[PDB]
Coordinates of C-alpha atoms and ligand atoms in Angstrom, one line a residue:
Chain A
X276 CA -31.3 97.6 -63.1
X277 CA -34.1 95.7 -61.4
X278 CA -34.7 92.8 -63.9
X279 CA -37.8 90.7 -63.6
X280 CA -36.2 87.5 -64.9
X281 CA -32.6 86.7 -64.2
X282 CA -30.7 83.9 -66.1
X283 CA -29.9 80.6 -64.3
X284 CA -26.4 80.6 -62.9
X285 CA -24.1 77.5 -63.0
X286 CA -21.3 77.0 -60.6
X287 CA -18.6 74.3 -60.5
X288 CA -18.8 72.4 -57.2
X289 CA -16.2 69.7 -57.9
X290 CA -14.9 68.0 -61.0
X291 CA -17.9 66.7 -63.0
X292 CA -20.5 68.2 -60.6
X293 CA -22.2 71.6 -61.3
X294 CA -24.7 73.5 -59.2
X295 CA -27.5 75.3 -61.0
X296 CA -29.3 78.2 -59.3
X297 CA -32.6 79.7 -60.5
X298 CA -34.6 82.6 -59.1
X299 CA -38.3 82.9 -58.8
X300 CA -39.7 86.4 -59.2
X301 CA -42.0 87.5 -56.3
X302 CA -44.7 90.1 -56.1
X303 CA -42.5 92.4 -54.0
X304 CA -39.9 92.1 -56.8
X305 CA -37.5 90.1 -54.7
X306 CA -36.2 86.7 -55.8
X307 CA -36.0 83.4 -54.0
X308 CA -33.2 81.0 -55.2
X309 CA -33.3 77.2 -55.7
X310 CA -30.4 74.9 -56.2
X311 CA -30.0 71.8 -58.3
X312 CA -27.2 69.7 -59.7
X313 CA -25.9 68.7 -63.1
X314 CA -23.6 65.6 -62.8
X315 CA -21.4 64.6 -65.7
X316 CA -21.6 60.9 -66.8
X317 CA -19.4 60.2 -69.8
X318 CA -20.6 62.2 -72.8
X319 CA -23.9 63.1 -71.1
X320 CA -25.1 64.5 -67.8
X321 CA -27.7 63.8 -65.1
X322 CA -30.0 66.6 -63.8
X323 CA -31.0 66.7 -60.1
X324 CA -34.1 68.9 -59.8
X325 CA -35.5 71.4 -62.4
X326 CA -35.7 75.2 -62.1
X327 CA -38.9 77.0 -61.1
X328 CA -40.6 76.8 -64.5
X329 CA -40.2 75.4 -68.0
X330 CA -38.3 78.3 -69.6
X331 CA -35.7 78.4 -66.8
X332 CA -35.4 74.6 -67.0
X333 CA -35.0 75.1 -70.7
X334 CA -32.0 77.2 -70.0
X335 CA -30.4 74.3 -68.1
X336 CA -31.0 72.0 -71.0
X337 CA -29.5 74.4 -73.5
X338 CA -26.5 75.1 -71.2
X339 CA -25.8 71.4 -70.9
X340 CA -25.7 71.1 -74.7
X341 CA -24.0 74.4 -75.8
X342 CA -21.6 75.1 -72.9
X343 CA -21.1 71.7 -71.1
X344 CA -21.2 69.8 -74.4
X345 CA -22.7 67.0 -72.3
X346 CA -26.4 66.9 -73.0
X347 CA -28.7 66.0 -70.1
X348 CA -30.2 62.5 -70.7
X349 CA -31.6 61.6 -67.2
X350 CA -33.3 63.6 -64.5
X351 CA -34.4 62.9 -60.9
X352 CA -36.4 65.1 -58.6
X353 CA -36.3 65.2 -54.8
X354 CA -39.9 66.0 -54.1
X355 CA -43.1 67.3 -55.7
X356 CA -43.0 71.0 -55.3
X357 CA -42.5 73.5 -58.1
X358 CA -38.9 74.4 -57.2
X359 CA -38.0 70.7 -57.9
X360 CA -40.5 69.6 -60.5
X361 CA -41.6 72.9 -62.0
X362 CA -40.0 72.2 -65.3
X363 CA -40.6 68.4 -65.7
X364 CA -42.7 68.9 -68.9
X365 CA -39.8 70.7 -70.6
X366 CA -37.6 67.7 -69.9
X367 CA -40.1 65.1 -71.1
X368 CA -40.6 67.1 -74.2
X369 CA -36.9 66.9 -74.9
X370 CA -36.9 63.1 -74.4
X371 CA -35.2 63.1 -71.0
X372 CA -35.6 60.0 -68.9
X373 CA -37.2 61.3 -65.7
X374 CA -37.4 59.6 -62.3
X375 CA -39.1 60.4 -59.0
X376 CA -40.3 58.7 -55.9
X377 CA -43.6 56.9 -56.4
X378 CA -45.2 59.2 -53.8
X379 CA -43.8 62.3 -55.7
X380 CA -45.4 61.1 -58.9
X381 CA -48.8 60.5 -57.3
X382 CA -49.1 63.9 -55.7
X383 CA -47.6 65.9 -58.6
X384 CA -51.0 66.3 -60.4
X385 CA -52.6 67.8 -57.3
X386 CA -49.8 70.3 -56.9
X387 CA -50.2 71.5 -60.5
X388 CA -47.0 69.7 -61.6
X389 CA -46.1 67.3 -64.4
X390 CA -45.2 63.8 -63.0
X391 CA -42.0 62.0 -63.7
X392 CA -42.1 59.2 -66.2
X393 CA -40.6 56.4 -64.0
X394 CA -41.1 55.5 -60.4
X395 CA -37.9 54.9 -58.5
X396 CA -37.4 51.4 -57.2
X397 CA -35.6 51.3 -53.8
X398 CA -33.9 48.3 -52.3
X399 CA -34.3 47.1 -48.7
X400 CA -31.6 49.7 -47.7
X401 CA -33.7 52.6 -49.2
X402 CA -31.2 53.3 -52.0
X403 CA -31.0 52.8 -55.7
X404 CA -28.0 53.1 -58.1
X405 CA -30.3 53.6 -61.2
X406 CA -28.4 56.8 -61.8
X407 CA -24.9 55.8 -60.8
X408 CA -22.7 57.4 -59.7
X409 CA -25.5 59.1 -57.9
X410 CA -26.9 57.2 -54.8
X411 CA -30.6 58.1 -54.5
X412 CA -31.6 57.6 -50.9
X413 CA -35.1 57.6 -49.3
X414 CA -34.8 58.8 -45.6
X415 CA -38.5 59.0 -44.9
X416 CA -40.9 61.9 -44.4
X417 CA -39.5 65.3 -43.4
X418 CA -40.0 68.6 -45.3
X419 CA -42.6 66.6 -47.3
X420 CA -43.8 63.0 -47.1
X421 CA -42.1 62.2 -50.3
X422 CA -38.7 63.9 -50.1
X423 CA -35.6 62.0 -51.1
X424 CA -31.9 62.9 -51.2
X425 CA -29.1 62.3 -53.7
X426 CA -25.5 61.5 -52.6
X427 CA -22.2 61.5 -54.5
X428 CA -20.2 59.4 -52.1
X429 CA -17.2 59.2 -54.5
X430 CA -16.9 63.0 -54.4
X431 CA -18.2 63.5 -50.8
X432 CA -21.3 65.5 -51.8
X433 CA -24.8 65.2 -50.4
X434 CA -27.7 67.2 -52.1
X435 CA -30.2 67.4 -49.3
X436 CA -32.9 69.4 -51.0
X437 CA -35.5 71.0 -48.8
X438 CA -34.9 68.3 -46.2
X439 CA -31.8 70.3 -45.2
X440 CA -32.2 73.9 -44.1
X441 CA -30.0 76.7 -45.4
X442 CA -27.1 77.8 -43.3
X443 CA -28.1 80.5 -40.9
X444 CA -31.7 79.3 -40.7
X445 CA -33.5 79.8 -37.4
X446 CA -36.8 78.1 -38.5
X447 CA -37.9 75.1 -40.6
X448 CA -39.5 77.3 -43.2
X449 CA -42.7 76.2 -45.0
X450 CA -44.1 73.5 -42.7
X451 CA -47.5 73.1 -44.4
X452 CA -46.7 69.6 -45.8
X453 CA -44.1 68.6 -43.3
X454 CA -43.8 65.7 -40.9
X455 CA -42.5 67.4 -37.8
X456 CA -42.3 64.2 -35.8
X457 CA -40.1 62.4 -38.3
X458 CA -38.1 65.2 -39.8
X459 CA -35.1 64.8 -37.4
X460 CA -35.1 61.0 -38.0
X461 CA -34.8 61.6 -41.7
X462 CA -32.0 64.1 -41.4
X463 CA -30.0 61.8 -39.1
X464 CA -30.6 58.9 -41.5
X465 CA -29.0 60.9 -44.3
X466 CA -26.0 61.8 -42.1
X467 CA -25.5 58.2 -41.2
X468 CA -25.9 56.9 -44.8
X469 CA -23.3 59.4 -46.1
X470 CA -21.2 59.5 -43.0
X471 CA -18.1 60.7 -44.9
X472 CA -19.5 63.5 -47.1
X473 CA -18.2 66.9 -46.1
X474 CA -20.0 69.0 -48.8
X475 CA -23.7 69.4 -48.0
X476 CA -25.9 71.2 -50.5
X477 CA -29.3 72.5 -49.3
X478 CA -32.0 73.8 -51.7
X479 CA -31.5 77.5 -50.7
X480 CA -28.3 79.4 -50.3
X481 CA -24.6 78.3 -50.3
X482 CA -23.2 74.8 -50.0
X483 CA -21.8 74.2 -46.5
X484 CA -20.6 71.3 -44.3
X485 CA -22.1 68.7 -42.0
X486 CA -23.1 71.5 -39.6
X487 CA -26.2 71.8 -41.8
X488 CA -27.2 68.4 -40.4
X489 CA -26.8 69.6 -36.8
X490 CA -28.8 72.8 -37.6
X491 CA -31.7 71.0 -39.2
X492 CA -31.8 68.2 -36.6
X493 CA -32.0 70.7 -33.8
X494 CA -34.6 72.9 -35.5
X495 CA -36.7 69.9 -36.2
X496 CA -36.3 68.5 -32.7
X497 CA -37.4 71.9 -31.2
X498 CA -40.5 72.0 -33.5
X499 CA -41.5 68.3 -32.8
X500 CA -42.0 69.0 -29.0
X501 CA -45.4 70.5 -28.0
Chain B
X272 CA -21.7 83.6 -56.5
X273 CA -24.6 83.9 -54.0
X274 CA -23.6 86.8 -51.8
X275 CA -25.4 87.3 -48.5
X276 CA -25.0 91.1 -48.5
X277 CA -25.3 93.0 -51.8
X278 CA -24.3 96.7 -52.0
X279 CA -26.9 99.5 -52.3
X280 CA -27.5 100.5 -55.9
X281 CA -28.1 104.0 -57.1
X282 CA -30.1 105.0 -60.2
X283 CA -30.6 108.3 -61.9
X284 CA -34.3 109.0 -62.3
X285 CA -34.2 112.5 -63.7
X286 CA -31.8 115.4 -63.3
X287 CA -31.1 115.9 -59.6
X288 CA -33.2 112.9 -58.5
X289 CA -31.7 109.5 -57.7
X290 CA -33.3 106.3 -56.5
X291 CA -31.5 104.0 -54.0
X292 CA -32.4 100.3 -53.8
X293 CA -31.3 98.1 -50.9
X294 CA -31.8 94.4 -50.4
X295 CA -32.8 92.6 -47.2
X296 CA -31.3 89.1 -46.9
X297 CA -33.9 86.5 -46.1
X298 CA -33.6 83.0 -44.5
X299 CA -34.3 81.3 -47.8
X300 CA -31.3 83.4 -49.0
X301 CA -33.6 85.4 -51.2
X302 CA -33.5 89.2 -51.2
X303 CA -36.3 91.8 -50.9
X304 CA -35.7 95.2 -52.4
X305 CA -36.7 98.6 -51.1
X306 CA -36.6 102.0 -52.9
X307 CA -35.9 105.4 -51.6
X308 CA -34.8 108.8 -53.1
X309 CA -31.9 111.2 -53.0
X310 CA -32.8 114.6 -54.2
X311 CA -30.2 117.2 -54.9
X312 CA -30.7 120.7 -53.3
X313 CA -27.9 123.0 -54.2
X314 CA -24.6 121.7 -52.7
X315 CA -26.4 119.1 -50.5
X316 CA -29.1 116.5 -50.9
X317 CA -32.4 115.3 -49.2
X318 CA -32.9 111.6 -48.4
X319 CA -36.3 110.0 -48.7
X320 CA -36.4 106.8 -46.6
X321 CA -33.4 104.8 -45.3
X322 CA -32.2 101.4 -46.3
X323 CA -33.1 98.3 -44.3
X324 CA -30.4 98.7 -41.6
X325 CA -27.8 101.1 -40.4
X326 CA -24.8 99.8 -42.5
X327 CA -26.8 99.9 -45.7
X328 CA -28.0 103.4 -44.8
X329 CA -24.3 104.2 -44.1
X330 CA -23.6 103.3 -47.7
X331 CA -26.1 105.9 -48.9
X332 CA -24.6 108.6 -46.7
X333 CA -21.1 107.8 -47.9
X334 CA -22.2 107.6 -51.6
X335 CA -23.7 111.0 -51.2
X336 CA -20.4 112.4 -50.0
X337 CA -18.0 110.6 -52.2
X338 CA -19.8 110.0 -55.5
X339 CA -22.6 112.6 -55.6
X340 CA -20.4 115.3 -53.9
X341 CA -23.6 116.5 -52.4
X342 CA -23.8 115.3 -48.7
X343 CA -27.1 114.4 -47.3
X344 CA -28.2 117.0 -44.8
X345 CA -32.0 116.3 -44.4
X346 CA -34.1 113.1 -44.4
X347 CA -37.8 112.3 -44.4
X348 CA -39.5 108.9 -43.9
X349 CA -42.8 107.7 -45.2
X350 CA -43.9 105.4 -42.3
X351 CA -42.5 103.5 -39.3
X352 CA -41.5 100.2 -40.7
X353 CA -38.0 98.8 -41.0
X354 CA -37.6 99.3 -44.7
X355 CA -38.2 103.1 -44.3
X356 CA -36.8 103.9 -40.9
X357 CA -34.4 101.0 -40.3
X358 CA -31.3 103.3 -40.4
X359 CA -32.6 106.5 -38.7
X360 CA -30.0 106.0 -36.0
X361 CA -27.1 106.2 -38.5
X362 CA -28.6 109.5 -39.9
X363 CA -28.8 111.0 -36.4
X364 CA -25.2 110.0 -35.6
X365 CA -24.1 112.1 -38.7
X366 CA -26.1 115.2 -37.6
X367 CA -28.6 114.9 -40.4
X368 CA -31.9 116.7 -39.7
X369 CA -34.6 114.0 -39.8
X370 CA -38.4 114.4 -40.2
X371 CA -41.4 112.1 -40.0
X372 CA -45.1 112.2 -39.4
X373 CA -46.1 112.7 -35.8
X374 CA -47.7 109.3 -35.8
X375 CA -44.6 107.7 -37.4
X376 CA -42.5 109.0 -34.5
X377 CA -45.0 107.8 -31.8
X378 CA -45.0 104.4 -33.5
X379 CA -41.3 103.9 -34.0
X380 CA -39.9 102.8 -30.6
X381 CA -42.7 100.2 -30.4
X382 CA -41.6 98.7 -33.7
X383 CA -37.9 98.5 -32.7
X384 CA -37.1 101.7 -34.7
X385 CA -35.3 104.9 -33.9
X386 CA -37.8 107.9 -34.2
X387 CA -37.1 110.9 -36.3
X388 CA -36.0 114.1 -34.6
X389 CA -38.7 116.4 -35.8
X390 CA -42.5 116.0 -36.3
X391 CA -43.7 117.2 -39.7
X392 CA -46.2 120.1 -39.4
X393 CA -48.9 119.9 -42.2
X394 CA -51.0 122.7 -43.4
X395 CA -54.8 122.8 -44.0
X396 CA -54.3 121.0 -47.3
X397 CA -52.2 118.2 -45.6
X398 CA -48.9 119.4 -47.3
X399 CA -45.7 120.9 -46.1
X400 CA -42.8 122.5 -48.1
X401 CA -40.3 122.1 -45.2
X402 CA -38.1 120.1 -47.6
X403 CA -38.8 122.1 -50.8
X404 CA -38.7 121.3 -53.7
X405 CA -40.2 118.2 -52.1
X406 CA -43.9 118.4 -51.4
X407 CA -44.6 116.1 -48.4
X408 CA -48.3 115.1 -48.5
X409 CA -50.4 113.3 -45.9
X410 CA -53.2 111.3 -47.7
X411 CA -54.6 109.5 -44.6
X412 CA -54.2 105.9 -43.5
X413 CA -53.7 103.1 -46.1
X414 CA -50.8 100.7 -45.9
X415 CA -50.3 101.9 -42.3
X416 CA -52.2 104.5 -40.2
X417 CA -49.2 106.9 -40.6
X418 CA -48.0 106.6 -44.2
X419 CA -47.2 109.8 -46.1
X420 CA -46.0 110.4 -49.6
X421 CA -43.5 112.7 -51.3
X422 CA -44.0 114.5 -54.6
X423 CA -41.7 116.4 -56.9
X424 CA -44.3 118.2 -59.0
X425 CA -41.6 120.3 -60.8
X426 CA -40.2 117.0 -62.2
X427 CA -43.5 115.0 -62.3
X428 CA -42.4 112.4 -59.8
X429 CA -44.4 110.9 -57.0
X430 CA -42.8 108.6 -54.4
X431 CA -45.7 106.6 -53.1
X432 CA -43.8 104.3 -50.7
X433 CA -45.8 101.2 -49.6
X434 CA -49.0 103.1 -50.2
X435 CA -48.6 102.3 -53.9
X436 CA -48.3 98.6 -54.9
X437 CA -45.6 97.4 -57.2
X438 CA -46.5 96.9 -60.9
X439 CA -47.8 93.4 -61.5
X440 CA -49.2 93.1 -58.0
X441 CA -52.3 91.0 -57.5
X442 CA -52.6 91.6 -53.7
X443 CA -52.1 94.4 -51.2
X444 CA -49.1 92.6 -49.6
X445 CA -48.5 92.9 -45.9
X446 CA -52.0 93.8 -44.6
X447 CA -51.4 93.4 -40.9
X448 CA -51.3 97.1 -40.0
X449 CA -53.4 98.4 -42.9
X450 CA -56.6 100.5 -43.1
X451 CA -58.5 98.5 -45.7
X452 CA -61.4 100.9 -45.6
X453 CA -59.5 104.1 -46.3
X454 CA -56.6 102.8 -48.5
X455 CA -58.4 103.5 -51.8
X456 CA -59.3 107.0 -50.6
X457 CA -55.7 107.7 -49.7
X458 CA -54.4 106.5 -53.1
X459 CA -57.0 108.7 -55.0
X460 CA -56.0 111.6 -52.8
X461 CA -52.4 111.2 -53.9
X462 CA -53.5 110.9 -57.6
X463 CA -55.5 114.1 -57.2
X464 CA -52.9 116.1 -55.3
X465 CA -50.3 115.3 -58.0
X466 CA -52.5 115.2 -61.1
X467 CA -49.8 115.9 -63.6
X468 CA -47.0 113.5 -62.4
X469 CA -46.3 110.7 -64.8
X470 CA -43.5 108.9 -63.0
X471 CA -44.8 107.0 -60.0
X472 CA -42.3 105.3 -57.7
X473 CA -43.5 102.4 -55.4
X474 CA -41.4 101.0 -52.5
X475 CA -40.8 97.7 -54.3
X476 CA -39.8 97.1 -58.0
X477 CA -39.4 99.5 -60.9
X478 CA -40.7 103.0 -61.3
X479 CA -43.8 103.1 -63.5
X480 CA -46.7 105.4 -64.6
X481 CA -50.1 106.4 -63.2
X482 CA -51.5 102.9 -63.8
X483 CA -50.0 102.1 -60.4
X484 CA -52.7 104.4 -59.0
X485 CA -55.4 102.3 -60.8
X486 CA -53.8 99.0 -59.7
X487 CA -53.7 99.9 -56.0
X488 CA -57.1 101.6 -56.0
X489 CA -58.7 98.5 -57.5
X490 CA -56.8 96.1 -55.2
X491 CA -57.8 98.1 -52.2
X492 CA -61.4 98.4 -53.4
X493 CA -61.6 94.6 -53.8
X494 CA -60.2 94.0 -50.3
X495 CA -62.4 96.6 -48.6
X496 CA -65.6 94.8 -49.6
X497 CA -66.7 91.9 -47.2
Ligands
ZN32 ZN1 -40.7 71.9 -51.0
ZN33 ZN1 -44.5 99.1 -44.4

């Protein structure tokens, strides 16, 4: 009735784009969800963000092989916290090619996380098509110093990660590692880079629209003012 | 897929004893569970603790009338927090007779809660059988200054509320209103008053055995020492 460990759920977002949601068990026996993406690419698939730990990330790998029939071959992570890089070791064990921002790979050891194998190389416009059709974009410090976002401009989807706050949020959440001064600038930079995308996916809760940009911008503006 | 509001669940514990579990939606779109009891008494039933809010408590009232066919006529609450008295108003609108510790009723309007209608009157041994076969026991301050417990000695069940920590806990949880000095004494007083009960129900997570007494006593002992 009250299970400690719940299996990772997979939901179709659009054609060729799946959202994976995993739950972390808390001491009060509640759960906190985290979203990631699986993006089809020919006969294989790209993973955006891991689950909370190795065995939950192992579920995503197995689901991509057994159900999707498109095994994950590449993975990218949006920042160096355990809801995004918690299961990096399980990917590198399976031979997945893993990418992260150079800053995310440097601070992963301190946060008790396995680093990604490759540093992303951004161009002068702070983008990289190394995982096309994903556009990996670096908007600057916000939720963390190292957070990056992933856009799917062909399908009108932005995965904002923790940089974008869940719908209904009245606070910025965990602000221990945040850059309150720059958070609004980073949110607006994402909205301007993917000006057409109508489907915005935060790290927690349901996918929504561009109002998530307004919500996070205003919550960050209010927090930036002493 | 990810619902904001999940319905209250009801679980048979033993014959004539049900456990209700309700979830509070959080800003990270996680959920926090809370347990209470419904105890059959002839053609009606006794409610131990509300849900988080009025509509979730309204589900319990309606489930007791439609599914159990034993409408709730009495209610008792273990302390004046929102996961125990969050729906007292819905019980009072239905004419249900409500009880709580005197201190819980003094403390409720200050914490944004509706007080219970009657103050419990305890005997020299800090018990009352006003809601027999329930034994309502006052063990002294612990999680809060006012927390009380409910025992079903005929069935070997103790409902510890927040006074008992969930299984797997490594901390005392929300310690803002706690009595760290007396918490262990209150836990041991409950374990002594109901020496034979083998089914211990905390406020969060699954029912377990008397090792919950050991866990909370040792966590409170560790925290009481400067
Ligand atoms: Zn984070
Ligand atoms: Zn409480």
